Amino acid sequence: AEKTFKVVSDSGIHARPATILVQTASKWNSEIQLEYNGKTVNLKSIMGVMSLGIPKGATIKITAEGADAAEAMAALTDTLAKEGLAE
């Protein structure tokens, strides 16, 4: 599964909302990645996610591989919306 998003948060993706996003990813059996500006990290790894330094107005790409990948992508979409991060 693959989807691109636009970041709409004034502060980009950092701190507590980034933490909640990682926690959403971690619920799923699938392996899940976040990619910004040509660098891909494990979305279950908060260190990697913070390392990307994702700013306001970025385009990001989430990918998920596994048998619950669709659930994962829906849940991540929902978290990105609930946290005011991306659409």
CATH code at position 66: 3.30.1340.10
Q: Of 14, 20, 27, 48, which is the active-site residue?
A: 14
32 catalytically annotated: no
Helical segments of the chain, H only: 15-25, 46-51, 69-82
Considering only CA atoms, which of 39, 5, 23 is closest in space to residue 72?
A: 23
Q: d(Cα 50, Cα 1) in Å, to the nearest integer?
A: 23
Identify the domain containing residue 80 by its residue range: 1-87
Q: d(Cα 46, Cα 51) in Å, to the nearest integer?
A: 8
Experimental method: X-ray
The structure was resolved to a resolution in Å of 1.6
Q: Report the number of distinct structural domains present in the chain.
A: 1
Centroid of chain to Cα 55: 13
